[PDB]
Symmetry: C3
Subunit: 211 residues, 3 copies
Amino acid sequence: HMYSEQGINNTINISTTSLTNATQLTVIGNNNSVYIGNNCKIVSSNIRLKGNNITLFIADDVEIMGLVCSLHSDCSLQIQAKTTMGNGEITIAEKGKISIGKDCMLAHGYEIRNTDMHPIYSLENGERINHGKDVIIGNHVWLGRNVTILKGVCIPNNVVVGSHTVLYKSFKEPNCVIAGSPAKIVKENIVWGRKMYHSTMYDDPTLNEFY
Amino acid sequence: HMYSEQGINNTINISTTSLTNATQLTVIGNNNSVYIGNNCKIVSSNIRLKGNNITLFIADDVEIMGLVCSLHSDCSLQIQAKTTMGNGEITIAEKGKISIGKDCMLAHGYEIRNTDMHPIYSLENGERINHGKDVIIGNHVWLGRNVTILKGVCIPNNVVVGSHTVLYKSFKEPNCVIAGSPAKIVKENIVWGRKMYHSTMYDDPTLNEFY
Amino acid sequence: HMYSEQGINNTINISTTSLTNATQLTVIGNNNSVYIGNNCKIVSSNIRLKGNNITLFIADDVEIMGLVCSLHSDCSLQIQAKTTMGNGEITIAEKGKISIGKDCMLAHGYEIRNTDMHPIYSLENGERINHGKDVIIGNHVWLGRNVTILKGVCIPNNVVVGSHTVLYKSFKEPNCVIAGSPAKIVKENIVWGRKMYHSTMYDDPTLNEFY
């Protein structure tokens, strides 16, 4: 695996069983850490760590195609095992963190960020009022196409976010579909799978952990 | 007209008066049917029929630029006469159908589909609850730019859908503008035309059938 | 600075201190006027004036990257000093005007227009009911990413429009954030800046005019 470093005390640990074809990984700064686990396919992506003390953690069996990712100083991106991601954008700044859980499915066109990238202040006392806020995406979350996840949003486990939805606020209820304008729970007590089965979840051995 | 077939009992009937420059039509499977009527211009498009028993019907005088279309087994796309379509995406799966009526105008950036492409099941009994559902777009419908039409949606005749609108549900009232979040009827008893006339529909001979 | 003219009585006044690399400016028609002030950077853009009596006014210190702009007869685009604009689209037709104030920041993916580009008529009397309407963006407005501003919209001074918001209607209150579906005021009595300061607006000498 080839990449560009400018700086020192960086640790780039990419498993020999993983593939990174057509991916550019650039590390500019010091004390940054990259971990890519076994049997990953991180393809046609552009990942830029610019700053110090940055952490990128990608667990085993993760498949990414066409991610554009920018991390700044003291920021963390963690993506857990068996997650798949199509084309999309992740930006982290303001020393923040974004976490994506196990076996998520992120469809084409996601935009996920913990930051507005410019400050907004109160006229009453001058104080900044739009500080960055971490994003937490739970286990087994499916983002439909063209979903935008903004700062501070926490998504519960086993959730479907409907295509073309923008989330500004966190939710607490697991096992639901969230969609609409504004985003709201539109269906409760569900589970999603990858492979289209015509009739029943019991036909899909991969889903036993949810019921 | 050149195209790729892999399979048999396919029928590809493209009128000798129609143009298909820079269009890729791929048929992979058996017993599929393609009809393109007279005086069509189907340009810079990518149309893939992968499966068996697929029907693609495009009537006379249809102009398409930059359509990306995927059809799977037993699916049907029907587009009626004088309809125009700019760049966009149509996906049909789950043995479903999408119909577009006569003299529609689909502006840049449409996404139309009858499927979520992955299953959602009820935790209560395991049953699938997001089966594909047909899409019916009536006669003389105008989709403004960047409109998304999701599964099951039926749009009445002589409707304008405002740009950047997502439709999840069907409507019944013809001769209206639907726009907003959620999509709603914002104007009733109207008719749209193609050519900008400054003052009156009576100046446009092409609109006599609507009043 | 090179450009294409087809027609006469055009005036193309581009300051010798401004840069227009990779920008195509095309003027097709008569009596059109282009002014680009000092120390501008108008880059990788495509600006087409097709018609007569068109005015394009760009003041000093304006930086534009990847604007696609179309103006038709008797239309006006005015962009005031120190405004910055990333990639985006502006369309003006129906002899209308779009104005953008001083020191605005237009993030990637804006779409701004004064026109529906096709007519909608009343069935009751045949009259056109969707005439073009001017767009006025005030001083010190920040459009977040992928914002759409439709015809007739006036935005007050010192406003933030949240990313992925569509505005259909004007607002009157300055010093606010507008976001959501439908767009609404979500925060009042604020001011935004460009450079991320961790704690206070008083640290940014460029903002003294707002409190």
